[PDB]
Amino acid sequence: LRHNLSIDGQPLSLAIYAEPTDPKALLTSMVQASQGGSAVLPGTLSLYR
Amino acid sequence: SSAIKTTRLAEAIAGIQLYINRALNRIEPNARADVSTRQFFTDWTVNNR
C-alpha cells in the first residue's frame, strides 16, 4: 500500500521508458599548408651556346 | 510514497474513519464511552464504509 503496488508487488504505475539521447555522427575536413621556394643559385656560365 | 493521489475530502474520510475506529476499539484512553453508544456507532458495521 505504501509503495502503491498490487497484492504481489507488481507496480500500479507503468515505468516510463526513458528513451535515450542516442549517438550522433562525426565529421572530418581537409587541412592545407604553404611553403616557399629555394634560393636561386647563380648558374655558372659555360662556354656553349 | 508520492505516487498515490487523493483528494482533501477523501483524506478527511480516511482520518475520520481511523479516529472513529480508534475511539471505538477502546485503545485510545479516556474515550467518551457515553457518547460512543449512539445509533451511528451501533450501526458502524454499515457506517464504516
**Phi-psi sector, B30: left (phi>0), alpha (psi -120 to 50), beta:** left
The method of structure determination was cryo-EM
Model resolution, angstroms? 4.3
Tell me if chain A has a CB within 8 Å of the CB of B1.
yes
Cβ-contact A24, A33 below 8 angstroms: no
User: Which residue has 662556354 as its cell numbers?
Assistant: A47
Q: Which residues pair with B44 in a beta bridge?
A: none
> Does the CB of B3 have a partner CB in chain A at under 8 Å?
yes
Query: Best mutation site among A4, A5, A12, A13 for testing chain B: the one with the most B CBs within 10 Å?
Result: A4
State the DSSP code for B27: -
Task: Measure A28 CA to nearest chain B CA, in Å.
Answer: 49
